[PDB]
């Protein structure tokens, strides 16, 4: 589709048949079709996790402007006490995610081989793409046209960049992400990465 | 106290070594006027020696019976900066260099006279290849998985 | 299948009892090695399926766990006990002599058989109640036997591993400890300190 | 000149330039951060 840099010719292996294809591959990671097949799924999963992470880091902090709830900032939520110890929660999360990710992994190797429920054999997911399961995972039956996939990928890339910014800003500033925006909005021409 | 060693900041021999070096440096200073340039150089050397000893004291090194720092390379988390991290950095840099060299060698293998491109470097091709080595681990791992790394 | 979406090895057709195509390392490619491995697996399953009843019943009756019963032999002159009653022949040199002689005869007798089918299911005098009359029931019986043996092997592995983490404690003591406060007495506090 | 650019791509000249830049960078790095024995970060 569009060009990430006008005046430069798109690589041949990027034929534009994929959603969100702008011909951006200066270092040639996706020359091998198997590598491209793996990296598409990797990007999809990374973005889908990153958007949720950013939503969970930003929104539970914007409460200060509204004063509705009281929750510690994203880097202090770990130290708080909970009804169960860290070890038990970590073990349960490991046990569940092992099964979930092993089930997801098998579809990349042999598509259409994990479409049937293992206990109740009369329940199955309708056939679809590798990274787009559908069925019960799409309860509202929104049509997955190419435009929506491009929107999803753009939002995922933006959220990856946002999470990287969130991580980097806290390391050097020592505060959360929302107050950094307010500090910049206070005096824009003096509060930047150049402190002076 | 691994293997009977002691911290640098608690070692008396370390302070004795620092005092001896400072005293040796200060002896030559008395031969020159305070405003003379050699006096400034000697003052800078003394300040650098003091700063080096203070920095060695701050980093939590271990001293032996002779007042000299010793390096632990067994993998203890308290001493991961002596061997582990610089080793990983060196491995990354060496892999970058090797991958760049291998890619350049492979690229020119199909030319009519490949031996001519080895003594007279094709600068644009090398420059286009140089930046590619920044992600060498991923490329190497995927090449190994696809069976391309080893010649048949 | 042991894992849906994974191809089966060519030598595991799924016709043998308790066959689910599990061989990631390919240890059974050789036809001669595979035949021996079935006998070894059956022997291990049969041996482990007798230890489990003998590892919980003595503990559940208050006679001590399974590792306390071996401590007396280290002491000099220790005498064995059974049901709280010492046995006259409980001396250490007498115990080993009967144990070695008794099992050195049965195992050597088992080794001498040459028909592969009898090395796993000999039949004959070891089946007095006649459960082998129906070939149709025999296959489901073999599947039941194979399925239970691996479970007992896993149970014995758990028994052995739990002892290392909690010395001097019995498996029933482990169950009682976990039952009281499930959300803090579990595997988690051991894996991470 | 094409022939002048060709002579700059010969192995000894390129090696000399690369190693000179490398040595300058290393000398400056050691000047900024002297007496380094452990990685503190
Ligand atoms: C991804 C991810 C990253 C980058 C971090 C990184 C962090 N965790 Mg965290 N965690 C992450 C997922 C998880 N953590 C935890 C459980 C904890 C705990 C109990 C603690 C942290 C703490 C921390 C902070 C230590 C510096 C830092 C913000 C510490 C902290 O918040 O100190 C300021 C802390 O005490 N994490 C769980 C549950 C198993 C996670 C999933
Ligand atoms: C992804 C993701 C992840 C990993 C988390 C993880 C967490 N959230 Mg959370 N959250 C998310 C998305 C996510 N959130 C989104 C999309 C919204 C909207 C929220 C709104 C939200 C609220 C309002 C609160 C949490 C809280 C918490 C913490 C304790 C709750 C718990 O796990 O039980 C935990 C670290 C709680 C917390 O940290 O305070 C106790 C809390 O009060 N979350
Ligand atoms: C804003 C980002 C975004 C966008 C545009 C989409 C868009 C889409 N997703 Mg999706 N997804 C996202 C984030 C997003 N997703 C995240 C964060 C997760 C992880 C929880 C998923 C998990 C997910 C699954 C598991 C599946 C989809 C599917 C789909 C497609 C059909 C469903 C649909 O139209 O939903 C539209 C969604 C919105 C308009 C979001 C509105 C905002 C709300 C708060 C569609 C292209 C399905 C698919 O492609 O197969 C049919 C499918 O099976 N998504
Ligand atoms: C869309 C992403 C995004 C957005 C909106 C912001 C926005 C902001 N960043 Mg920021 N940042 C980002 C990504 C982003 N960042 C990433 C990816 C990194 C990692 C390199 C950083 C590292 C960073 C630092 C170290 C600091 C900020 C700071 C700031 C604030 C002052 C503006 C400034 O100095 O710009 C800085 C801009 C950059 C460093 C370039 C980021 C790349 C651009 C945004 C690509 C997106 C187009 C402002 C709210 C400063 C702050 O705390 O505010 C007072 C500050 O000190 N950012
Ligand atoms: C086949 C494996 C096996 C082995 C090696 C043992 C070995 C042992 N059992 Mg035993 N046991 C087994 C199966 C086994 N048991 C089974 C299947 C049951 C259920 C009926 C029992 C029920 C049982 C009881 C009730 C007691 C023992 C006890 C003992 C110990 C000494 C006395 C004894 O029975 O000697 C082995 C001789 C014949 C099995 C000895 C370590 C005694 C003990 O705890 O000693 C301290 C004891 O009180 N066992
Ligand atoms: C006496 C004056 C003087 C001063 C103040 C400097 C200062 C500097 N030189 Mg330098 N240099 C000088 C004379 C001087 N040089 C002479 C006479 C030569 C021989 C012709 C060189 C050859 C030289 C080389 C070959 C290199 C430097 C580099 C550097 C920078 C090292 C810091 C760095 O890498 O950060 C990053 C750089 C900056 C923050 C600003 C530049 C620093 C700004 C290094 C450099 O710039 O690294 C990129 C470097 O590689 N210098
Ligand atoms: C494989 C052998 C080897 C290794 C691992 C090292 C390792 C090191 N040398 Mg080194 N060195 C070596 C051979 C080696 N050298 C040889 C053969 C010579 C003689 C040419 C030198 C001459 C030398 C000097 C002159 C200096 C170092 C310094 C250093 C330290 C570098 C500090 C920094 O920031 O960079 C580092 C521990 C620097 C340092 O501060 O050491 C503590 C320093 O100033 N080295
Ligand atoms: C030094 C500065 C370096 C960066 C310079 C960036 C110049 C502007 C171009 C990049 C931004 C852009 O195209 O935004 C618009 C793009 C693309 O946004 C949309 O993405 C869709 C994906 O399916 C389609 O490609 C759409 O055509 C496209 O408009 O935004 C992003 O890709 C977001 C993440 C990257 C943001 C910029 C990072 C740098
Ligand atoms: C997960 C990633 C791979 C991990 C395993 C890497 C090694 C390869 C697989 C070995 C798996 C395996 O069992 O390989 C067995 C293989 C062949 O052994 P044999 O030819 O003796 O027996 C073959 C029969 O078992 C086939 O049925 O190699 C060996 O001889 C043993 C090598 C290790 C010897 C260790 C002890 C040395 C003293
Ligand atoms: C998944 C992710 C973040 C996930 C976060 C999650 C789930 C949760 C976070 C939490 O906050 C919560 C919710 C609650 C808190 O209490 C705890 C934590 C745990 C803190 C980020 C991904 C982030 C992913 C990023 C940033 C990826 C960047 C990739 C780039 C830039 C690649 C560039 C190129 O590869 C191209 C495209 C083409 C090549 O040819 C050239 C180059 C240039 C190499």
- Ranges of each domain in chain C: 15-64+70-184
A43-81 burial, b for 16+ CB within 10 Å, e for fewer? bbeebeebbebbeebbeebeeeeeeeeeeeebeeeeeee
H-run or E-run covering C172: helix C171-180
- Do residues A50 and A160 touch, judged by C-beta distance below 8 A? yes
Could you identify the residue written with the tokens 């042999």? A110
Tokens of A92: 């349960």
Closest approach of chain B CAs to the CA of A27, in angstroms? 5
For residue A74, the ligand 1 atom closest to its alpha carbon is: 28
Q: Per DSSP, what are the bridge partners of residue B62?
A: B7, B70
Closest approach of chain B CAs to the CA of D39, in angstroms? 4
- Do residues C188 and A88 touch, judged by C-beta distance below 8 A? yes
H-run or E-run covering C149: helix C135-165
Experimental method, per PDB record: cryo-EM
For residue A149, the ligand 3 atom closest to its alpha carbon is: 46
Q: In a 10 Å sphere around its CB, with 0-12 CB exposed, 13-18 middle and 19+ buried, how is residue B95 labelled?
A: middle
Q: Per DSSP, what are the bridge partners of residue A116?
A: A124
Pairing, β B6-7 against β B62-63: antiparallel
Tokens of C84: 């709280």
d(CA B14, CA B79): 20
- Do residues B62 and B72 touch, judged by C-beta distance below 8 A? yes
Tokens of A131: 């990274």
- Do residues D5 and B49 touch, judged by C-beta distance below 8 A? no
Pairing, β B69-70 against β B62-63: antiparallel
For residue D25, the ligand 6 atom closest to its alpha carbon is: 50
**Residue A57 CB contacts under 8 Å (≥ 6 apart), including other chains:** A74, A163, A166, A177
CA angle C21, C47, C92 (to 5 degrees): 150
Could you identify the residue written with the tokens 């900024």? D32
d(CA B69, CA B14): 9
Q: Which of B132, B146, B148 sits opposite A27 (nearest CB)?
A: B132
* Sheet-wide strand order for B62-63: B6-7, B62-63, B69-70
Nearest residue to C8 via CA among B58, B126, B96, A110: A110
d(CA B24, CA B17): 11
State whether residue A128 is helix, strand or coil: coil
State whether residue C104 is helix, strand or coil: helix
Tokens of A29: 């990671």
Q: Given an 8 Å threshold on Cβ–Cβ distance, is A91 in contact with C4?
A: no
d(CA A138, CA A132): 9
Q: In a 10 Å sphere around its CB, with 0-12 CB exposed, 13-18 middle and 19+ buried, how is residue C138 labelled?
A: middle
d(CA C83, CA C61): 10
**Residue A142 CB contacts under 8 Å (≥ 6 apart), including other chains:** A148
Q: How far is the CA of A130 from the centre of ligand 8 (A)?
A: 26
State whether residue B80 is helix, strand or coil: helix
H-run or E-run covering C85: strand C85-86
Could you identify the residue written with the tokens 């099992």? C103
Interface probe for A, chosen from B140, B142, B147 (most Cβ of A below 10 Å), is: B142
H-run or E-run covering C180: helix C171-180
d(CA C179, CA C30): 47
Q: Given an 8 Å threshold on Cβ–Cβ distance, is A118 in contact with C4?
A: yes
Give the distance, in angstroms, between the CA of residue C193 and the centroid of all CA atoms in the same chain.
32
Find the Cα–Cα–Cα–Cα dihedral A6, A10, A15, A18, rounded to 10°.
-60
In DSSP notation, A9-48 reads PPPTT--S-STT-----TT-TT-SHHHHHHHHHHHHHHHH
| Closest CA in chain D for residue B59 | D40
d(CA A34, CA C179): 50
Interface probe for B, chosen from D13, D29, D37, D40 (most Cβ of B below 10 Å), is: D37
d(CA A18, CA A33): 13
Nearest residue to A170 via CA among A156, A186, A181, A158: A181
Phi, psi of C71 (to 5 degrees): -75, -30
Q: In a 10 Å sphere around its CB, with 0-12 CB exposed, 13-18 middle and 19+ buried, how is residue A125 labelled?
A: middle
Nearest residue to A44 via CA among A150, A162, A165, A140: A150
- Do residues B111 and B117 touch, judged by C-beta distance below 8 A? yes
d(CA A69, CA A90): 27
d(CA C142, CA C135): 11
Q: How far is the CA of D28 from the centre of ligand 6 (A)?
A: 6
Q: Could you tell me what percentage of chain C is helix, strand and coil, using 3-state DSSP and rounding each to the nearest 5?
A: 50, 0, 45
User: Closest residue (by CA) to atom 26 of ligand 5?
Assistant: C58
Counts for chain A of helices (H) and strands (E), in that order: 4, 0
**Residue C2 CB contacts under 8 Å (≥ 6 apart), including other chains:** C20, C21, C22
- Do residues B7 and B63 touch, judged by C-beta distance below 8 A? yes
Residues of A at the annotated binding site for chlorophyll b?
A: 4, 48, 85, 91, 101, 104
Neighbours of C159 (CB within 10 A): 19
Give the distance, in angstroms, between the CA of residue A189 and the centroid of all CA atoms in the same chain.
33
**Residue A34 CB contacts under 8 Å (≥ 6 apart), including other chains:** B146
**Residue A33 CB contacts under 8 Å (≥ 6 apart), including other chains:** A13
Name the maximum alpha-carbon separation found in chain B: 75
Neighbours of B94 (CB within 10 A): 11
**Residue C120 CB contacts under 8 Å (≥ 6 apart), including other chains:** C38, C39, C42
């Amino acid at each position: 589709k569009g060009e990430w840099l006008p005046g430069l010719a798109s690589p041949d292996y990027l034929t534009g048949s994929l959603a969100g294809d702008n011909g951006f591959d200066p270092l040639g990671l996706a020359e091998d079709p198997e590598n491209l097949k793996w990296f598409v799924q990797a990007e999809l999963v990374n973005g889908r996790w990153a958007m949720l992470g950013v939503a969970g880091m930003l929104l539970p902090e914007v409460f200060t402007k509204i004063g509705i709830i009281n929750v510690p900032e994203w880097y202090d939520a770990g130290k708080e006490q909970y009804f169960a110890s860290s070890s038990t929660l970590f073990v349960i999360e490991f046990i569940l995610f092992h099964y979930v990710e092993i089930r997801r992994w098998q579809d990349i190797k042999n598509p259409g081989s994990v479409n049937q429920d293992p206990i109740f054999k009369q329940y199955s997911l309708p056939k679809g793409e590798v990274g787009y399961p559908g069925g019960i995972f799409n309860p509202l039956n929104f049509a997955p046209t190419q435009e929506a996939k491009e929107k999803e990928l753009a939002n995922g890339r933006l959220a990856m960049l946002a999470f990287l910014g969130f991580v980097v800003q806290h390391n050097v500033t020592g505060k959360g992400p929302f107050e950094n925006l307010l500090q910049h909005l206070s005096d824009p021409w003096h509060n930047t990465i150049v402190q002076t | 106290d691994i293997s009977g060693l002691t911290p640098c900041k608690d070692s008396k021999q370390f302070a004795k070594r620092e005092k001896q070096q400072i005293k040796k440096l200060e002896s030559s200073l008395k031969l020159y006027a305070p405003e003379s340039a050699p006096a400034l150089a000697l003052n800078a050397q003394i300040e650098k020696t003091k700063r080096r000893f203070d920095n060695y004291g701050k980093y939590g090194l271990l001293c032996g019976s002779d007042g000299l720092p010793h390096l632990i390379v067994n993998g203890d988390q308290r001493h991961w900066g002596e061997f582990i991290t610089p080793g990983i950095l060196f491995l990354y840099i060496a892999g970058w260099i090797g991958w760049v060299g291998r890619s350049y060698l492979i690229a020119i293998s199909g030319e009519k006279k490949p031996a001519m491109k080895e003594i007279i470097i094709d600068v644009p091709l090398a420059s286009r290849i140089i930046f590619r080595g920044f992600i060498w681990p991923v490329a190497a791992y995927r090449e190994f998985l696809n069976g391309d790394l080893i010649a048949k | 299948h042991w894992m849906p979406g994974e191809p089966r090895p060519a030598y595991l057709d799924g016709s043998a009892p308790g066959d689910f195509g599990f061989d990631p390392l390919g240890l059974g490619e050789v036809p001669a090695n595979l035949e021996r491995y079935k006998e070894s697996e059956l022997i291990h399953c049969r041996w482990a399926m007798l230890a489990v009843p003998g590892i919980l019943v003595p503990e559940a009756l208050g006679y001590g766990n399974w590792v306390k019963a071996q401590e007396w032999a280290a002491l000099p002159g220790g005498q064995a006990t059974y049901l709280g009653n010492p046995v006259p022949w409980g001396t250490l040199p007498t115990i080993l002599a009967i144990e070695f002689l008794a099992i050195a005869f049965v195992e050597h007798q088992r080794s001498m058989e040459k028909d592969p089918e009898k090395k796993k299911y000999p039949g004959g005098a070891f089946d007095p109640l006649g459960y082998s009359k129906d070939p149709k029931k025999l296959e489901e019986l073999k599947v039941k036997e194979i399925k239970n043996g691996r479970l007992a092997l896993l149970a014995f592995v758990g028994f052995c591993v739990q002892q290392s983490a909690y010395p001097g404690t019995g498996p029933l003591e482990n169950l009682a400890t976990h039952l009281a406060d499930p959300w803090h007495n579990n595997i988690g506090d051991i894996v991470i300190p | 000149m094409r022939d002048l650019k060709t002579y700059l791509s010969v192995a000894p000249v390129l090696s000399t330039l690369w190693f000179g830049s490398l040595a300058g960078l290393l000398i400056e790095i050691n000047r900024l951060f002297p007496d380094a024995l452990t990685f503190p970060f």
